[PDB]
Amino acid sequence: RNRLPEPKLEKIGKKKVIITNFGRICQAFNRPIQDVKDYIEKELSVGGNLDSNDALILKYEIQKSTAFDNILYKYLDEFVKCNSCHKIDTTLTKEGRRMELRCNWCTATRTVQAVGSATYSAQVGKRSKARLQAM
């Protein structure tokens, strides 16, 4: 029943979605910047970056909502949240190769693995331009 900052959005240009609260959010469950960003951007299969004043940018377009939450839920129940107690105080480790994660509020250690997708993405979606750049 923990409290997580409620991500809050902007619709700029009716394409992009800027997420102002990015920095604050990443701090809260105690994981770094680039790694968190990766997972998000991979799932949605879009570009955009962060940089700036630590407000994220994404090329994904949605009707403005609180429904960004679903994405965050996936990240938090894979990575941070232990399956022993249900509780985030958790802290990432480096054990062996592709081995990570520790709990510390009862210290029941748990390992997890990190995304490196690269199986299938389809194609989308203009062409001409693609070939032109890949000239």
Partner: protein, 49 residues
Amino acid sequence: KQRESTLKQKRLTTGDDGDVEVADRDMSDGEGEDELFVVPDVLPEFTFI
């Protein structure tokens, strides 16, 4: 205002090099609040009502 600027386009026809010209590109929205710019009085009354 931008939506009012998007409804001033001008014009159809597929191609003018390789890329398309389309107006309108769909929006069915719609509006939120309507903030209503509160200051007749705020705080004191709220503990009675």
